[PDB]
Each structure stands twice: as C-alpha cells, then as structure tokens.
Amino acid sequence: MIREERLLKVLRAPHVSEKASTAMEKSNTIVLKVAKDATKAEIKAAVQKLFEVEVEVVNTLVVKGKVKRHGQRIGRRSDWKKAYVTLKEGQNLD
Amino acid sequence: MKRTFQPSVLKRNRSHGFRARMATKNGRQVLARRRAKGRARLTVSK
Amino acid sequence: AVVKCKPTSPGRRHVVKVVNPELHKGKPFAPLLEKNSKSGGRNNNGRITTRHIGGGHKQAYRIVDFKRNKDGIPAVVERLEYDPNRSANIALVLYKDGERRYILAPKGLKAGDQIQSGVDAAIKPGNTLPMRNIPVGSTVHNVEMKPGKGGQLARSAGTYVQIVARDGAYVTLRLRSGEMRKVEADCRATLGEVGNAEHMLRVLGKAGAARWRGVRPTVRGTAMNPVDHPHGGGEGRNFGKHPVTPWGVQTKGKKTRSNKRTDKFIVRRRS
RNA sequence: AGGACCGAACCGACUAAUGUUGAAAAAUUAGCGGAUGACUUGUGGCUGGGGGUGAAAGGCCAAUCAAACCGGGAGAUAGCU
RNA sequence: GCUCGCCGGAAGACCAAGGGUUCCUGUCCAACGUUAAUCGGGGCAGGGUGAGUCGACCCCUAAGGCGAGGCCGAAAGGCGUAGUCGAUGGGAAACAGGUUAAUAUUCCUGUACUUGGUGUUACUGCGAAGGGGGGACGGAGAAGGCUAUGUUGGCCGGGCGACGGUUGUCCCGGUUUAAGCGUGUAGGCUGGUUUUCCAGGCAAAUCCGGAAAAUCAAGGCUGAGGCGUGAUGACGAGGCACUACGGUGCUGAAGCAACAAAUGCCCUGCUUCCAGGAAAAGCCUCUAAGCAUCAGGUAACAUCAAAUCGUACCCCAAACCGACACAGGUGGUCAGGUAGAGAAUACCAAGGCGCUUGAGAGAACUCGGGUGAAGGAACUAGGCAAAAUGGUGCCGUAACUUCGGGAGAAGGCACGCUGAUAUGUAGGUGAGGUCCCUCGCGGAUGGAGCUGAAAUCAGUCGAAGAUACCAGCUGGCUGCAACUGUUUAUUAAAAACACAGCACUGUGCAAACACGAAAGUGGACGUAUACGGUGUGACGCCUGCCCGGUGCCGGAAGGUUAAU
Ligand SMILES: [Mg+2]
Ligand SMILES: [Mg+2]
Ligand SMILES: [Mg+2]
Ligand SMILES: [Mg+2]
Ligand SMILES: [Mg+2]
Ligand SMILES: [Mg+2]
Ligand SMILES: [Mg+2]
Ligand SMILES: [Mg+2]
Ligand SMILES: [Mg+2]
Ligand SMILES: [Mg+2]
Ligand SMILES: [Mg+2]
Ligand SMILES: [Mg+2]
Ligand SMILES: [Mg+2]
Ligand SMILES: [Mg+2]
Ligand SMILES: [Mg+2]
Ligand SMILES: [Mg+2]
Ligand SMILES: [Mg+2]
Ligand SMILES: [Mg+2]
Ligand SMILES: [Mg+2]
Ligand SMILES: [Mg+2]
Ligand SMILES: [Mg+2]
Ligand SMILES: [Mg+2]
Ligand SMILES: [Mg+2]
Ligand SMILES: [Mg+2]
Ligand SMILES: [Mg+2]
Ligand SMILES: [Mg+2]
Ligand SMILES: [Mg+2]
Ligand SMILES: [Mg+2]
Ligand SMILES: [Mg+2]
Ligand SMILES: [Mg+2]
Ligand SMILES: [Mg+2]
Ligand SMILES: [Mg+2]
Ligand SMILES: [Mg+2]
Ligand SMILES: [Mg+2]
Ligand SMILES: [Mg+2]
Ligand SMILES: [Mg+2]
Ligand SMILES: [Mg+2]
Ligand SMILES: [Mg+2]
Ligand SMILES: [Mg+2]
Ligand SMILES: [Mg+2]
Ligand SMILES: [Mg+2]
Ligand SMILES: [Mg+2]
Ligand SMILES: [Mg+2]
Ligand SMILES: [Mg+2]
Ligand SMILES: [Mg+2]
Ligand SMILES: [Mg+2]
Ligand SMILES: [Mg+2]
Ligand SMILES: [Mg+2]
Ligand SMILES: [Mg+2]
Ligand SMILES: [Mg+2]
Ligand SMILES: [Mg+2]
Ligand SMILES: [Mg+2]
Ligand SMILES: [Mg+2]
Ligand SMILES: [Mg+2]
Ligand SMILES: [Mg+2]
Ligand SMILES: [Mg+2]
Ligand SMILES: [Mg+2]
Ligand SMILES: [Mg+2]
Ligand SMILES: [Mg+2]
Ligand SMILES: [Mg+2]
Ligand SMILES: [Mg+2]
Ligand SMILES: [Mg+2]
Ligand SMILES: [Mg+2]
Ligand SMILES: [Mg+2]
Ligand SMILES: [Mg+2]
Ligand SMILES: [Mg+2]
C-alpha cells in the first residue's frame, strides 16, 4: 500500500491544452502535471483513490524546461513531468 | 579540413571529468584551485 | 615439401612455400586453446621495450605438454596440427584413459603411432624418459633444465640435442648452438629431432609476409639523425664510427653475458 | 591464385590555372596515383616532454616542436636599442 | 497559382555521434540576416516528445583501468592477486493500418509475443561459486535456390483528344496487404540405438571422453523462400455529400499471371588457402555436499507485474567540428526507370531545391570556355598548358626476358536502321494435359505461353552509325632504384625510407636487451631452424690486398697500479 500522504503530494495540476481536450473527449484520457519523482503506480493509485475512479493505464513523459531571457539575463525553467492517464470507459470526471 | 576538436562527452568526462580529477592527488589540487579562485563551473561535468 | 612459386606477380616471384599435406585441414582441439593477446612490444608501462613488433594475424594459443607427466600410460597419435605460436608442428595424442593432449611433433612421427612417457618407456621417437635412462649419444629434444619444470631446450622446428656424457647426477649435452652444458641426470627428455626441419627453407618473398607475422620494418641507424641514434647524421652517407646499439653498446663482437650463477653449468661456450 | 590488371565508392595528393585583406589560417576546377591489401574506416583504450612515437622528413605530439602547453622561480639577465 | 530551370548513389529519405527546443502555432520587425523584408533557425508568448516488445538501464566479458590484502619504494606513490568496472561485441519478446499544427513499431483499431512472479491441479530427485557441451567466431572464390524490386500482359475505372489522324495492336491511373501461427521445401550437416567397462575431466557423476560387443541403414539437427491462415478484414482509383473552400463525412471496382532479377536471404553454409582466424554469460546437461515426502523440479491453467531514463528538431548540415547563415570536414542505412558492364555517365520519377542584393549596359583588362586561314613546337629552361587518343568484337603484334611477361605492343577492319532466315531464331523459363508413386511444397513426359541475344544475306539514310556523355596518345635510346608500398599535415613524393633476401655479431633461458631508484613487465606463455642489434638491400656474375692506426676478442709470464 502506497501511503496517502505521498498520494497527496504526487499530483500537481491538470494540464489544459488542445491535445488534452482532444484526448479527453476522444480517448477518455486526462493530462496531468505530476511530481517529477512520481512513478506510474503512484499516479494510478492516486487517481484511483483521490478521485475514486478506475484507471486503465498511465503513460508518462518528462518535459524539459525552456531557456528564457528576463531582460538580458539568461535563465532556465524547471523540468516537469506529464502523465496521460487513460480512464476506463463509462468513468467521468470534472 | 578536419579540425582538432571532435567532441565526445564520454571521452570528455573520462579525461577531464569530476571523478577523473578526484581520482588522483594532483587532480584534487585542481579542484582546490578552482574553488579558491571561485569558479562557477568547477569542472567539465554537467 | 618446398614448392617454388611461379612468377605470376612480383611477390610471388621468389616465394617458396613449405607444403605439408599431412596437417589437419580443420579446426584445432577447442579445450586446449586459450587466448593469446598481442603486446606490440609494450610492457606494463606502455612503452616499447622490444622494437619492430606489431600487427599480424590473430593467434590462438595451443597448450602444449612440455612437462610430459603421463607416465606408464601409452598414447596413440591422433593427428598432426599447425601451431602459429611456434615453428614446429604439434601432435594431438589420445591416451587410453580418455585424455587428449598436444605434444611437439617429432621428425618421423605420424598419425597412429604409439608414444609412452615414464622411465620404463622404450626408446623410439616420441617417448620421454630421464637421461639417466637414456643411452649416451642419442638425440633428444624438449629437454628439461630442472626436473619437473618442463622442457625448455630444442623446441624449434628442426632441433635436437646430443647426449655426449654422463657423470653420476649429471649428463653433458651438446646443444644446438654447439654449447656443452651440464644438466642433472634426472631431467626428462624426448627422443628424436623436432619435426618441421624444412621450416628454414621457406622464403617469404615480400614484405607483407613479414607483416603477417607481426614484424614491423627495421629502420637502419645511419638513416637517422644524431639525436635518434649514434650512427645518425652525416651529409651524404657517412659512418665514421664504430657500430653500436641505439644505446651506445658495441655490437660487432662484444660479449654481453654476465651471469656468474650458471657458469658452473657451462662446460664450453659456443665457438 | 595474385602486396596481379582497367576502373567508381573510398584513401591519397603528381601537374597547371585561379585565389593570396581568399569561399577556405592549404582550398576549388580540369586532369592524376592506389583501389583484396604492408588496404581503409568507426568507437573505446594505451604510450607524456629530454619524454613518447616515428617504413626516419628532426617528421608528429590539439592551426604551437633542434625539446609542447599552463602556472610558478620572475620585475631571469641584457656592457644592447 | 501557372510556366522555366537544377539535383536525383543526392543537393532525396532514416539514424548514431554531436548540438540541445533550433520543432509547431500566434504575433512583432528595433537588433540579427552581407539589400528590402510583411519573412526567418531572429525577438516575445503558448503548445508539443506518451513504449512490457525500439534504444539505454540491466546479465556478460575484450583491450584496458581501478585494485582488499600483498610486494616494492625518501614521502607522495608504482605494480599487481582475489575481485570489481569497462562496448565498439554476446544476451527475452510487435506487426499492419489509421490519426496530430507539431509524437508515434510509443496513441487508437485489429491481431500477436516474451520473461518473471504468486496460486491451485497432476507428476516427482532437487541441488554449484564446481565438471562437460554450446555460445564460438579467418580470408578468398564458385555456383545453385529464392525474395525485395521492376517490366509486360490481363483485369478494373476513366478518356476519345486546342493542329492532320486516333473505337484501337489506342491513352492515363490503379492492381496493396505485415508480424504471428501451421506446414517443413530447395538445400546443408550427421550414421543411429542398446548394454558392459574405464589410470581421464582437481571430488563425484547417469554427463563428456575413451574401450568393447550386439542390432538397425535410417533416424536426427538445421533450413531461405513458398503455400495456408491472419484477412467476410484493412487499404484502395475514384465517386456521393456538406462545405469555415482549408477541409469534414459517406461509399468504394479490380486487387491476377508470366518473365527478368539483386552487392540482400538460404550462407555462422560449401569449396579452398595459409598468414591458421576473441572471451564470458545467458541456454542445455552432470553430479557434490545438503534436503527427505518438506523444500524445490516441469506440465497445464488462473491471476499479477514488466519499473526508470531517452523519444521534439537538424544530422551532411544555415542547427556538428571549422570565429560567419564559411564553396571545407563528418560514421552508418535505403538504392526506382531508360540507355549502359556498372553504385560510372546522360536524361528523368518519388521527393527536394533555384544557393538572402538586384536592375541595366554590352569599353579596356582579367577569369572560365568555343571556333580558326596557311604553317605545325619555329614558342619555351622544358611540347608547361592545351589539343589529340579513347568502346566492343576479330585479325595481327618486335627487341628483350627472370619464360610470367613485353602487350591493350604497334597497326588495321567491322559497327546505324529496316526486312528475311525466324510474322522473335538459338537459348532460357516452364503451364495445361497424361502417366507413376514408398503420395507430396512429389517424379517423369509434355510443350502452350513468356522472354530473348548473336550472326549471315538483301536493302536504305546521312558529310559522319563506339554519332551525345563516357572513354589509353604511341614508339625509340639511356641514368637511378629491383618491384607493391612509405615520407617532410601547410613550398621537397624523390635516386630518400622500407622491403624480401644476404652476412656479421650477441644471446643457454631467471636469455641478451629494453622500460623501470625497485618490485616487476615486455622479449615470450617463445627456447639457437629462436630472439636482439648492425650494415647491405630482388635476381645474375662476383666480392681482390692490407690488422700498421682505432676498436673488439683471446691470453696471463713480467712491469705498473686503488681502497685496505
Ligand atoms: Mg517513456
Ligand atoms: Mg627487430
Ligand atoms: Mg632486416
Ligand atoms: Mg631497414
Ligand atoms: Mg635523414
Ligand atoms: Mg650521440
Ligand atoms: Mg659524401
Ligand atoms: Mg671517410
Ligand atoms: Mg592490385
Ligand atoms: Mg581532383
Ligand atoms: Mg585502379
Ligand atoms: Mg637534415
Ligand atoms: Mg602542430
Ligand atoms: Mg621539453
Ligand atoms: Mg632545452
Ligand atoms: Mg631569482
Ligand atoms: Mg624583464
Ligand atoms: Mg512559387
Ligand atoms: Mg536535369
Ligand atoms: Mg551520378
Ligand atoms: Mg530560442
Ligand atoms: Mg520553423
Ligand atoms: Mg522596416
Ligand atoms: Mg535588414
Ligand atoms: Mg524563432
Ligand atoms: Mg544486458
Ligand atoms: Mg560486469
Ligand atoms: Mg581486469
Ligand atoms: Mg593496499
Ligand atoms: Mg593496479
Ligand atoms: Mg554496445
Ligand atoms: Mg516529424
Ligand atoms: Mg561452463
Ligand atoms: Mg571470418
Ligand atoms: Mg517477385
Ligand atoms: Mg488531337
Ligand atoms: Mg484533330
Ligand atoms: Mg496500362
Ligand atoms: Mg503467413
Ligand atoms: Mg523522430
Ligand atoms: Mg539534408
Ligand atoms: Mg548563405
Ligand atoms: Mg557549409
Ligand atoms: Mg540508376
Ligand atoms: Mg565579354
Ligand atoms: Mg578548342
Ligand atoms: Mg561556327
Ligand atoms: Mg589554326
Ligand atoms: Mg568551318
Ligand atoms: Mg587547317
Ligand atoms: Mg626550340
Ligand atoms: Mg627562341
Ligand atoms: Mg602536358
Ligand atoms: Mg584536353
Ligand atoms: Mg648521364
Ligand atoms: Mg622505387
Ligand atoms: Mg609506387
Ligand atoms: Mg601523407
Ligand atoms: Mg609539403
Ligand atoms: Mg608536393
Ligand atoms: Mg620476464
Ligand atoms: Mg643503402
Ligand atoms: Mg671486401
Ligand atoms: Mg687491429
Ligand atoms: Mg684485453
Ligand atoms: Mg698494475
């Protein structure tokens, strides 16, 4: 059993996107911004517990941070992690 | 023409990297000089 | 059989092959093989210690019985094989108990002959018995220097050692160089000359045949600069100096033996 | 069969012209040599400076070599400008 | 958007290395861009990289590195045992179609596969850090069998022609389909099987190896491709409709045969040669201690798991190495048509470009080319450079020679197209059909159909038929070096180095020698038919005299002579 505190610190935010809206309406897949050290089992357990909903599969990818220039000083945004969580058919989420 | 720098990260880190410097006595003196001078990038190693 | 090649090309003009049709035309015996990694003439410091070595064909090592310890048990000779590691051909023998080994092939040895080590062995080419059991005046090879150490003398393709005397614990040998040396009379020796006597009758014909054997080219010393060699230098071809090594040691005639430990074992030097 | 022949890839660099504040701190164009061999190439490794390596030109060792580079002795010394 | 031109064994496509968001969309034009710029690899904002099967990680080791102890060394430290790292190599498994502005063998649809688990059920010798097998290995060459792929025909759909003709022996386009599973073929290798015994494999062994005897010649292993299924599917020319004119939705014909055919596959094969061609694990098996009815083993079934990291984009390039958006350099993979021996070369397809200043004019001069009267090296240091030769087949071909060569010597003839032989031949392929069978992916016979050189004869056209690109100038005397090779990266490619060969000399093995204060290591897991050094430098005929000087070797009677 994965602890509930970790399950509360795994998920960061939902990711709004044209691709996220397409996968949500077609494949019934939500797109989440997750913690960087979070694994697929921790994500599947978190969505299955905190939302009480049935997860079919989780695909993950790491998003590399961009290099920006505030004024003339260079800088780099953070690497973050993105999860495609495919819900089972019939399941629904706000 | 073929110029003298043909990069390879593996050979770069095996030759000039952190653990290659920390392996020997004189390489540890290299890292002590760069810390005293205050280098931002202390070695090659990314 | 030496075969002069027909001159269809320079590099085949002067080639003499040594063709032996009795050698096995197949793979060697796999358990007796091991890896023989090349050196390039470079020691553990990586520097070149011995020059002119490098390249050549990959060579697997053949484990050869020089100690020859299977006493009493007779062995039949299974087949003759090529060894790239040495000038002499090797013989794959099969003991009665089921062990196979490689020995140096003697002159007249062929497939199907019986060999036997030990003291009570007969005296035919192939047997190995101590030289207090060997008659004076016979030609042996694969001769031990110390008892049980393994054979070290007369291992190259056509060599042999004569036994000229025996005084108790020692026998006096006539080595292939002409040196008369005392060896203990308990050291094993193998009867007969070593096989491939016409090995020296080959002619390589071209430079690549030496590069196949891992012999890099030798730059003669006077073709250098004086920083490189003592012979180097000159405006034209000049050699007004005595021939030395690259390290300044006289070569034409100067002796270099400085071992006072083994001087009691040397009866007469070579002439 | 061949350190065989002709000839592309590939490796090299014999001749001429251009260019010489170049397209290029050595190249282009037209020809040229080898092209199954002592061939060539990728990756990784080893050899360290009076030392390496060198089919040997004092050649090469990061566009630097009759003794690399960097830091230090060091503000060497300079009857010389 | 219509035309034109260029590449097309690349100037197309896919990657590794390397770079690191350069990817896509919106917006901006100050700077950057060798001009303008509304554009951009530029600025700004947002979005984008989805894996049990790809790769890494991981199991394994090579060269080599590190190295407990250890040995050695003023110190630092050097070497190295047990070990542990280390790919560029070995090791389980996924294919097709569809889709996004940007990802896909990653998502979706469909169909598979592998390795681990737990759990039952049947069965019952399990067990290794050990033994054995396997993994597991070279070069060259020859065919044969295939496929990728292409061409033609058939088939289906459409068309009937801006200018003479074109319902036909006419034109255009399409004719696609995988992994897996089953079959086990061409072909390659191999004698099987049973029992007994055994100084071997560090002990053991039922395993391997070796001895016997008996029986059976016929069992086994490997194996491309094909065929069947996958697939009543998907894809599919086109249509039918809406249409933000971008698109979105619906529907969907035929989907066959022959020939040619790879540098790819069978092939880690076969033949042959000498220069004699990695290791370890996974995998299979044998037993050791141990366990004794428990553990574990395999067999089926169920269930669970297969994590983590990379995945955008360039990759020959404007994104890599060159200071540049630099005519340079950069490893691997794919390899269409016509002609052609060909991956050369010419023109094209797919696809991608027109090289980030243009517009005129049409001086000298320079650059790169084209042609040239008569002469033809008189130019010049020198035929430098240009020009010329150039292909296939046949005839023919000198001195000399190491008998191989020289030699493609030199020199010369033919070459297009049409018709006939023969409405397309010889040859290749090989169907129907028939027959046989120990029956199939079978064996004969059979010749349909397809493909298809070359030659002779006759005719005909042009100035010219190897018509373009492509593509040897030849010969004579002579010096040097035998040759192939190598060399001054960046003014010297040579007669210089090397070379095979020859000779001298050292070296008896703890070898000489060399690198190392040393331990040690190379020589060499070699042993005088070996190794090192030196000189000469294929081959042929040869290599003469001098030991006084300088070296080296040998001598040990005398003289001299160190520390002590
Ligand atoms: Mg991933
Ligand atoms: Mg040598
Ligand atoms: Mg020599
Ligand atoms: Mg030489
Ligand atoms: Mg010189
Ligand atoms: Mg000197
Ligand atoms: Mg002179
Ligand atoms: Mg003189
Ligand atoms: Mg050749
Ligand atoms: Mg050129
Ligand atoms: Mg050629
Ligand atoms: Mg000089
Ligand atoms: Mg340099
Ligand atoms: Mg120096
Ligand atoms: Mg100096
Ligand atoms: Mg001073
Ligand atoms: Mg000064
Ligand atoms: Mg346009
Ligand atoms: Mg074109
Ligand atoms: Mg081309
Ligand atoms: Mg940017
Ligand atoms: Mg863009
Ligand atoms: Mg403006
Ligand atoms: Mg501008
Ligand atoms: Mg931009
Ligand atoms: Mg692994
Ligand atoms: Mg390992
Ligand atoms: Mg190791
Ligand atoms: Mg220690
Ligand atoms: Mg060590
Ligand atoms: Mg690898
Ligand atoms: Mg893309
Ligand atoms: Mg084993
Ligand atoms: Mg091979
Ligand atoms: Mg086909
Ligand atoms: Mg018309
Ligand atoms: Mg008309
Ligand atoms: Mg058609
Ligand atoms: Mg199938
Ligand atoms: Mg991609
Ligand atoms: Mg490109
Ligand atoms: Mg440009
Ligand atoms: Mg460029
Ligand atoms: Mg082509
Ligand atoms: Mg003009
Ligand atoms: Mg002209
Ligand atoms: Mg004209
Ligand atoms: Mg003229
Ligand atoms: Mg005219
Ligand atoms: Mg004229
Ligand atoms: Mg003249
Ligand atoms: Mg004149
Ligand atoms: Mg000329
Ligand atoms: Mg010309
Ligand atoms: Mg002369
Ligand atoms: Mg020459
Ligand atoms: Mg040459
Ligand atoms: Mg060169
Ligand atoms: Mg030069
Ligand atoms: Mg030159
Ligand atoms: Mg040694
Ligand atoms: Mg000479
Ligand atoms: Mg003489
Ligand atoms: Mg003398
Ligand atoms: Mg003397
Ligand atoms: Mg004296």
Residue numbers in the entry:
A (entry chain S): 1 to 94
B (entry chain c): 1 to 46
C (entry chain C): 2 to 272
Could you pull the original sentences from the published paper?
As a model protein, we have chosen the cold shock protein A (CspA) from Escherichia coli, which is a major regulator of the transcriptional response during cold adaptation in many bacteria. It consists of 70 amino acids (aa) that form five β‐strands connected by loops. Strands 1–3 form an antiparallel β‐sheet that is closed into a barrel by packing strands 4 and 5 to strands 1 and 3, respectively.
The cryo‐EM analysis shows the CspA70 nascent chain attached to tRNALeu at the PTC as it traverses the tunnel and emerges at the exit port. In the more stable conformation (CspA70‐1) the whole nascent chain backbone is traceable. The C‐terminal part of the nascent chain forms a short compact module within the contact range with PTC nucleotides G2061, A2062, G2505, U2585‐U2586 and, to a lesser extent, U2609. Residues A751 and A1614 of 23S rRNA contact the nascent chain in the upper part of the helical module, whereas several residues of the extended loop of L22 (Arg95, Arg92, Arg84, Lys83, Gly91, Ala93, and Ile85) pack against one face of the helix. In the lower part of the tunnel, the L23 β‐hairpin loop residues Arg69 and Gln72, and nucleotide A1321of 23S rRNA also interact with the nascent chain. At the opposite face, nucleotides A507–A508 establish interactions with the distal part of the helical density. The spatial constraints imposed by the tunnel walls disfavor β‐structure formation; density that can accommodate a structured β‐hairpin is observed only upon reaching the vestibule, as more space for chain rearrangements becomes available. The structure is partially stabilized by the interactions with 23S rRNA nucleotides A63, G93‐U92, and C1335‐A1336, as well as by weak contacts with the protruding loops of L24 and L29 at the exit port.
